[PDB]
Write a protein that binds this DNA or RNA. Structure first.
Lengths: 58, 239, 267, 121
RNA sequence: UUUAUCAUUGAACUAUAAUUGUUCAUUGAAGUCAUUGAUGCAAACUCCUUGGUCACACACACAUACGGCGCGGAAGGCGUG
């Protein structure tokens, strides 16, 4: 990398890294996987139950 | 400025910055109605002596009502000046029959009259005030445009400012007959709806089954209303 | 709380009375019990719901009935209700004042000059909807306008706000009735509870009535939906809406103009 | 296109190459082959079919040519209405990486046969 | 720049056609959507996948035209066991 980029980037600030333990990241990724699969399987079904008494429902 | 059409035509020819070029693929349809035909014919003959046959065309009705005629005025491939001239003449003439029956001049507009009208344009427009658009138009294909309560010079300036911003293009060939059939279909539907107005009671609603279908229901609703009045009287009572 | 328990795999000779006897009156109090039968055959499918008021008694009943002899088989009385992102929204209540009641249709009017009458104040609020009483307190420069509809109260507040009656600007808000105001004054003099009561409903659905509709006046009614069927009378009873209503209203307003041009009424 | 296609390779060696196969019409299909047969029926992954219009053909007759490209994805093309096939673009992973991948597939297949022999006992 | 259905008849009609052409309509069979459509032309902006984003130095070489005399990787040719 360039010199002036190094004098600009190493003087602005130093950010904080967050990190979690093994069981915490395992439980969070398992909840995210079940949320992704329940969003991939779901669909909006409001028009079927909202026009239920319509004369052309059958 | 003045109350003359030709002076405002000279003014709108002067300071509209080379407005002699017409619009490629341009179309306008003005459906109007007259009580009588003989007074309309002299003004239309003067208009055809002033405006050419290729630019403006006229379409009569089929004489179904026999009292109120319906005439289409189709301006095709028109310039911005001839449009203002034709709309000024027609908007003066279709209101002079009610306001000034004794003035007797088909090209001199008085001061007591305000120009207020409605004209159709095709859907393919691009605008990128007195003339406004409409919401909930009745025609499937065309857009209705409204002008209201203007003098002659304001009408000229507003029509020129409207046609200087809008961009037409690529109109369908026999769209005039399509608009004729759709207009006749829509107003025949509302004429049939007015024909359905005496046929409400006992005519075509199957009243013999509709009484028996709602005979216990209105009675139970009336009992609920009586219970509501009694419960309201018990609620407002101090005792 | 209304805790629900789902009994399953029941026998065929077990009606709702036997399930209610086995659920209620055994160290608990079951509020409701219903066995889900067939839609057209009438026979029970072997499942039933039991909803109790307390959750602890329902939990004790589910713990005691887990494996009990129910008509020759097991009871299976485990609970039905009680990590997804989608949950139904839950809310608290505004403790039922006279502002947050959707059935509250009476408008408190104030800022009067102690000069308007009751018939004139009826004439201010007459075309907004049907009305029941226009009585006002004396010496308090205020009043009460109770309608039947809530949309009529919305139209009355949206129109009549900022309208000066007798060179005096009006103040429109909500309020209770006279008996509820007397109860609030009796409970506020000792300051024990000061609790209010909700205004009763209309026992909906109501097909015949059309809201924001007034009628002052044999009847052969076709009961068609485009017209009006029933209406509340103007004091009060329930009237069938006839066809000669706009004619009677026109005769009434012409009589009102004739009697108001002379001074027989001020309203 | 400086690809330097192999000088002594055949269809068993040209597998997983981004082919540019020509047909009798000239409807050129671009995509990776993954299988063939005796009749040269070619499956094509991420395939695109490109043509030239009739108006562009006058400009093509003796510059820029606007070809019409449609996207077919994974298709399976027959060997009757095709004319010639060439190699247009090299694949992503190299020959040594495909060799290591094939050794891993052979070891996984031998492990699967040992698992079938263990489940059979 | 270019197209957006034919036929019988009625009131006139150019007319070798299954009245083709002009204005209006009744009727008859299918009746791509698309006209902000289709073709050609041309510029600018933005975003995606790929790499050795490598080791030394910011340097005066060449008519036999260029010291291909670094560690590798990708594709290929030729030769040997």
């Amino acid at each position: 990398r360039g010199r002036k980029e190094r004098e600009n980037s190493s003087q602005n600030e130093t950010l904080k890294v967050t990190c979690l333990s093994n069981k915490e990241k395992r439980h969070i990724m398992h909840v995210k996987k079940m949320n992704q699969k329940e969003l991939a399987q779901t669909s909006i079904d409001t028009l079927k139950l909202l026009y239920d008494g319509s004369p052309g429902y059958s | 400025q003045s109350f003359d059409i030709w002076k405002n035509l000279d003014r709108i020819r002067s300071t509209k910055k080379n407005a002699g070029q017409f619009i490629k693929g341009s179309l306008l349809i003005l459906p109007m109605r007259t009580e009588d035909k003989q007074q309309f014919d002299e003004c239309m003959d003067e208009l055809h002596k002033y405006i050419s046959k290729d630019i403006l065309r006229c379409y009569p009705q089929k004489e179904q009502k026999d009292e109120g005629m319906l005439f289409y005025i189709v301006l095709k491939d028109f310039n911005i000046l001839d449009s203002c001239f034709v709309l000024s003449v027609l908007l003066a003439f279709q209101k002079r029959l009610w306001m000034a029956p004794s003035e007797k001049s088909y090209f001199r507009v008085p001061k007591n009259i305000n120009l207020t009208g409605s004209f159709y344009l095709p859907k393919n427009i691009e605008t990128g005030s007195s003339i406004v658009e409409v919401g909930f138009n009745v025609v499937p294909d065309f857009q209705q445009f409204q002008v209201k309560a203007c003098h002659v010079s304001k009408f000229m300036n507003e029509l020129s400012n409207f046609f200087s911003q809008v961009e037409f293009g690529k109109c369908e060939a026999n769209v005039i007959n399509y608009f004729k059939r759709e207009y006749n279909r829509t107003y025949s539907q509302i004429s049939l709806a007015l024909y359905e107005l005496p046929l409400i009671g006992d005519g075509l609603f199957d009243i013999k089954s509709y009484i028996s279908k709602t005979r216990p229901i209105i009675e139970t609703s009336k009992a609920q209303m009586i219970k509501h009045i009694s419960e309201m009287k018990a609620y407002n009572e101090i005792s | 709380n209304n805790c629900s328990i789902f009994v399953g795999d029941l026998a065929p000779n077990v009606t709702e009375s036997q399930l209610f006897e086995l659920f209620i009156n055994r160290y608990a109090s079951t509020s409701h019990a219903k066995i889900v039968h067939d839609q057209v055959t009438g026979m029970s499918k072997g499942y039933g719901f039991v909803k109790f008021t307390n959750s602890d008694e329902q939990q004790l009943a589910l713990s005691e009935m887990q494996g009990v002899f129910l008509n020759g088989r097991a009871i299976k009385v485990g609970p039905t209700s009680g990590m997804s992102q989608f949950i139904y929204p839950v809310q608290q209540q505004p403790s039922l004042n006279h502002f947050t009641d959707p059935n509250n249709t009476t408008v408190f009017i104030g800022g009067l000059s102690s000069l308007v009458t009751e018939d004139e104040l009826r004439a201010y609020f007459q075309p907004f909807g049907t009305i029941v009483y226009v009585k006002i307190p004396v010496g308090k420069c205020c009043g009460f306008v109770q309608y039947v509809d809530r949309l009529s109260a919305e139209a009355a507040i949206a129109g009549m706000q900022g309208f000066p009656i007798a060179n005096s600007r009006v103040r429109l808000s909500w309020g209770r009735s006279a008996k509820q105001t007397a109860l609030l004054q009796q409970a506020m003099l000792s300051n024990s509870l000061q609790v209010q009561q909700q205004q009763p409903g209309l026992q909906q659905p109501n097909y015949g009535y059309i809201p924001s509709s007034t009628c002052e006046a044999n009847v052969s009614s076709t009961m068609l939906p485009g017209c009006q069927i029933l209406n509340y009378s103007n004091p009060q009873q329930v009237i069938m809406q006839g066809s000669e209503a706009v004619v009677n209203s026109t005769n009434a307003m012409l009589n009102r103009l004739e009697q108001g041009s002379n001074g027989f009424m001020f309203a | 296109s400086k690809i330097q296609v192999a000088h002594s390779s055949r269809l068993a060696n040209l597998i997983d190459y981004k082919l540019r196969v020509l047909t009798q019409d000239g409807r050129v299909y671009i995509g990776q082959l993954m299988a063939f047969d005796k009749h040269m029926n070619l499956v094509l992954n991420e395939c695109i079919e490109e043509r030239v219009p009739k108006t562009q053909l006058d400009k093509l007759r003796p510059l820029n040519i606007k070809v019409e490209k449609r996207v077919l994805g994974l298709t399976i093309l027959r060997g009757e209405q095709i004319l010639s096939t060439v190699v247009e673009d090299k694949p992503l992973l190299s020959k040594k990486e495909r060799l290591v991948r094939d050794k891993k597939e052979k070891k996984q297949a031998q492990k699967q046969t040992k698992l079938r022999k263990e489940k059979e006992k």
